[PDB]
mmCIF file with all atom_site columns, C-alpha atoms in Angstrom:
data_model
loop_
_atom_site.group_PDB
_atom_site.id
_atom_site.type_symbol
_atom_site.label_atom_id
_atom_site.label_alt_id
_atom_site.label_comp_id
_atom_site.label_asym_id
_atom_site.label_entity_id
_atom_site.label_seq_id
_atom_site.pdbx_PDB_ins_code
_atom_site.Cartn_x
_atom_site.Cartn_y
_atom_site.Cartn_z
_atom_site.occupancy
_atom_site.B_iso_or_equiv
_atom_site.pdbx_formal_charge
_atom_site.auth_seq_id
_atom_site.auth_comp_id
_atom_site.auth_asym_id
_atom_site.auth_atom_id
_atom_site.pdbx_PDB_model_num
ATOM 1  C CA . UNK A 1 1  ? 103.457 109.459 94.563  1.00 60.43 ? 7  UNK A CA 1
ATOM 2  C CA . UNK A 1 2  ? 106.393 110.609 96.701  1.00 58.39 ? 8  UNK A CA 1
ATOM 3  C CA . UNK A 1 3  ? 105.180 110.277 100.295 1.00 61.12 ? 9  UNK A CA 1
ATOM 4  C CA . UNK A 1 4  ? 102.190 108.206 99.133  1.00 62.00 ? 10 UNK A CA 1
ATOM 5  C CA . UNK A 1 5  ? 104.389 105.150 98.566  1.00 61.23 ? 11 UNK A CA 1
ATOM 6  C CA . UNK A 1 6  ? 105.295 105.609 102.236 1.00 61.54 ? 12 UNK A CA 1
ATOM 7  C CA . UNK A 1 7  ? 101.775 105.590 103.700 1.00 59.48 ? 13 UNK A CA 1
ATOM 8  C CA . UNK A 1 8  ? 101.085 102.567 101.485 1.00 60.89 ? 14 UNK A CA 1
ATOM 9  C CA . UNK A 1 9  ? 103.897 100.540 103.025 1.00 60.33 ? 15 UNK A CA 1
ATOM 10 C CA . UNK A 1 10 ? 102.756 101.556 106.499 1.00 57.23 ? 16 UNK A CA 1
ATOM 11 C CA . UNK A 1 11 ? 99.231  100.417 105.655 1.00 59.07 ? 17 UNK A CA 1
ATOM 12 C CA . UNK A 1 12 ? 100.279 97.102  104.102 1.00 59.46 ? 18 UNK A CA 1
ATOM 13 C CA . UNK A 1 13 ? 102.389 96.461  107.204 1.00 59.81 ? 19 UNK A CA 1
ATOM 14 C CA . UNK A 1 14 ? 99.269  96.772  109.378 1.00 59.46 ? 20 UNK A CA 1
ATOM 15 C CA . UNK A 1 15 ? 97.919  93.424  108.178 1.00 57.98 ? 21 UNK A CA 1
ATOM 16 C CA . UNK A 1 16 ? 98.532  89.715  108.788 1.00 60.19 ? 22 UNK A CA 1
ATOM 17 C CA . UNK A 1 17 ? 101.299 88.594  106.474 1.00 58.91 ? 23 UNK A CA 1
ATOM 18 C CA . UNK A 1 18 ? 99.043  86.709  104.036 1.00 56.25 ? 24 UNK A CA 1
ATOM 19 C CA . UNK A 1 19 ? 96.581  89.552  103.515 1.00 56.57 ? 25 UNK A CA 1
ATOM 20 C CA . UNK A 1 20 ? 99.192  92.016  102.299 1.00 57.52 ? 26 UNK A CA 1
ATOM 21 C CA . UNK A 1 21 ? 98.745  91.158  98.621  1.00 59.34 ? 27 UNK A CA 1
ATOM 22 C CA . UNK A 1 22 ? 95.058  92.003  99.042  1.00 62.26 ? 28 UNK A CA 1
ATOM 23 C CA . UNK A 1 23 ? 95.935  95.354  100.583 1.00 61.64 ? 29 UNK A CA 1
ATOM 24 C CA . UNK A 1 24 ? 98.608  96.118  97.968  1.00 61.67 ? 30 UNK A CA 1
ATOM 25 C CA . UNK A 1 25 ? 96.248  95.364  95.052  1.00 58.75 ? 31 UNK A CA 1
ATOM 26 C CA . UNK A 1 26 ? 93.581  97.453  96.736  1.00 55.00 ? 32 UNK A CA 1
ATOM 27 C CA . UNK A 1 27 ? 95.852  100.457 96.372  1.00 55.50 ? 33 UNK A CA 1
ATOM 28 C CA . UNK A 1 28 ? 96.921  100.275 92.724  1.00 58.10 ? 34 UNK A CA 1
ATOM 29 C CA . UNK A 1 29 ? 96.158  103.145 90.336  1.00 56.98 ? 35 UNK A CA 1
ATOM 30 C CA . UNK A 1 30 ? 92.565  103.462 89.118  1.00 54.79 ? 36 UNK A CA 1
ATOM 31 C CA . UNK A 1 31 ? 92.557  104.562 85.456  1.00 54.24 ? 37 UNK A CA 1
ATOM 32 C CA . UNK A 1 32 ? 89.040  103.181 84.763  1.00 54.41 ? 38 UNK A CA 1
ATOM 33 C CA . UNK A 1 33 ? 87.796  105.384 87.655  1.00 52.39 ? 39 UNK A CA 1
ATOM 34 C CA . UNK A 1 34 ? 85.961  102.495 89.305  1.00 53.27 ? 40 UNK A CA 1
ATOM 35 C CA . UNK A 1 35 ? 84.639  102.672 92.871  1.00 53.96 ? 41 UNK A CA 1
ATOM 36 C CA . UNK A 1 36 ? 86.438  100.520 95.460  1.00 53.78 ? 42 UNK A CA 1
ATOM 37 C CA . UNK A 1 37 ? 83.386  98.287  95.766  1.00 57.73 ? 43 UNK A CA 1
ATOM 38 C CA . UNK A 1 38 ? 83.211  97.835  91.991  1.00 57.71 ? 44 UNK A CA 1
ATOM 39 C CA . UNK A 1 39 ? 86.824  96.667  91.754  1.00 57.53 ? 45 UNK A CA 1
ATOM 40 C CA . UNK A 1 40 ? 86.143  93.836  94.241  1.00 61.40 ? 46 UNK A CA 1
ATOM 41 C CA . UNK A 1 41 ? 83.177  92.324  92.390  1.00 64.60 ? 47 UNK A CA 1
ATOM 42 C CA . UNK A 1 42 ? 85.144  89.855  90.263  1.00 66.52 ? 48 UNK A CA 1
ATOM 43 C CA . UNK A 1 43 ? 88.327  89.133  92.214  1.00 67.21 ? 49 UNK A CA 1
ATOM 44 C CA . UNK A 1 44 ? 86.753  86.343  94.256  1.00 67.07 ? 50 UNK A CA 1
ATOM 45 C CA . UNK A 1 45 ? 89.872  85.281  96.189  1.00 69.07 ? 51 UNK A CA 1
ATOM 46 C CA . UNK A 1 46 ? 88.084  85.417  99.552  1.00 70.42 ? 52 UNK A CA 1
ATOM 47 C CA . UNK A 1 47 ? 85.877  87.266  102.017 1.00 71.69 ? 53 UNK A CA 1
ATOM 48 C CA . UNK A 1 48 ? 88.602  88.343  104.455 1.00 71.69 ? 54 UNK A CA 1
ATOM 49 C CA . UNK A 1 49 ? 90.610  89.381  101.409 1.00 69.78 ? 55 UNK A CA 1
ATOM 50 C CA . UNK A 1 50 ? 87.777  91.546  100.053 1.00 70.65 ? 56 UNK A CA 1
ATOM 51 C CA . UNK A 1 51 ? 87.428  93.372  103.377 1.00 72.16 ? 57 UNK A CA 1
ATOM 52 C CA . UNK A 1 52 ? 91.156  94.080  103.260 1.00 71.68 ? 58 UNK A CA 1
ATOM 53 C CA . UNK A 1 53 ? 91.160  95.202  99.614  1.00 69.06 ? 59 UNK A CA 1
ATOM 54 C CA . UNK A 1 54 ? 88.146  97.431  100.221 1.00 66.89 ? 60 UNK A CA 1
ATOM 55 C CA . UNK A 1 55 ? 89.606  98.984  103.372 1.00 65.71 ? 61 UNK A CA 1
ATOM 56 C CA . UNK A 1 56 ? 92.992  99.762  101.770 1.00 66.17 ? 62 UNK A CA 1
ATOM 57 C CA . UNK A 1 57 ? 91.347  101.004 98.592  1.00 67.55 ? 63 UNK A CA 1
ATOM 58 C CA . UNK A 1 58 ? 89.121  103.408 100.577 1.00 65.24 ? 64 UNK A CA 1
ATOM 59 C CA . UNK A 1 59 ? 92.150  104.431 102.595 1.00 67.28 ? 65 UNK A CA 1
ATOM 60 C CA . UNK A 1 60 ? 94.346  105.283 99.588  1.00 66.05 ? 66 UNK A CA 1
ATOM 61 C CA . UNK A 1 61 ? 91.505  106.855 97.593  1.00 66.10 ? 67 UNK A CA 1
ATOM 62 C CA . UNK A 1 62 ? 90.964  109.377 100.381 1.00 65.23 ? 68 UNK A CA 1
ATOM 63 C CA . UNK A 1 63 ? 94.722  110.035 100.605 1.00 62.48 ? 69 UNK A CA 1
ATOM 64 C CA . UNK A 1 64 ? 94.983  110.608 96.864  1.00 60.82 ? 70 UNK A CA 1
ATOM 65 C CA . UNK A 1 65 ? 92.084  113.080 96.945  1.00 59.35 ? 71 UNK A CA 1
ATOM 66 C CA . UNK A 1 66 ? 93.598  114.978 99.854  1.00 60.77 ? 72 UNK A CA 1
ATOM 67 C CA . UNK A 1 67 ? 96.893  115.036 97.984  1.00 61.38 ? 73 UNK A CA 1
ATOM 68 C CA . UNK A 1 68 ? 95.234  116.281 94.776  1.00 62.95 ? 74 UNK A CA 1
ATOM 69 C CA . UNK A 1 69 ? 93.559  119.073 96.744  1.00 60.12 ? 75 UNK A CA 1
ATOM 70 C CA . UNK A 1 70 ? 96.798  120.170 98.420  1.00 55.29 ? 76 UNK A CA 1
ATOM 71 C CA . UNK A 1 71 ? 98.510  120.127 95.020  1.00 54.44 ? 77 UNK A CA 1
ATOM 72 C CA . UNK A 1 72 ? 95.709  122.128 93.432  1.00 57.24 ? 78 UNK A CA 1
ATOM 73 C CA . UNK A 1 73 ? 95.925  124.700 96.264  1.00 57.05 ? 79 UNK A CA 1
ATOM 74 C CA . UNK A 1 74 ? 99.681  124.980 95.916  1.00 53.50 ? 80 UNK A CA 1
ATOM 75 C CA . UNK A 1 75 ? 100.191 123.681 99.461  1.00 55.28 ? 81 UNK A CA 1
ATOM 76 C CA . UNK A 1 76 ? 101.775 120.588 97.867  1.00 53.41 ? 82 UNK A CA 1
ATOM 77 C CA . UNK A 1 77 ? 103.893 118.661 100.393 1.00 52.94 ? 83 UNK A CA 1
#
């Protein structure tokens, strides 16, 4: 979303330069409505990369939900 793209960049920045792809992919849209843990199960690609993915996924999932709630309540930022 609007300010969501922002908090994503800030989050991706927080990580060592070679774990940013993992973070980025952890925060892509979720049309199949899979849990964060479920989406890691077949990426392989590493242990330290799964921790990153999972952490960024959980981070952005919470932010999307908070955003959906604000939007539903007409507080929409």
